[PDB]
């Protein structure tokens, strides 16, 4: 819930988080973004 309610006004997303949790784990779990 803390991660879900984040905004650019309060947080900055690390590059490695973006890479991992938008490329690697979603594919490994059989879920793909539009």
């Amino acid at each position: 819930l803390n991660v879900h309610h984040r905004s650019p006004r309060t947080h900055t997303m690390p590059t490695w988080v973006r890479r991992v949790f938008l490329d690697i784990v979603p594919r490994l779990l059989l879920m793909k973004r539009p």
């Binding site: 650019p8 006004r9 309060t10 947080h11 900055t12």
Partner: peptide, 5 residues
């Protein structure tokens, strides 16, 4: 704080 704006 990012303080972008």
């Amino acid at each position: 704080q990012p303080r972008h704006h």
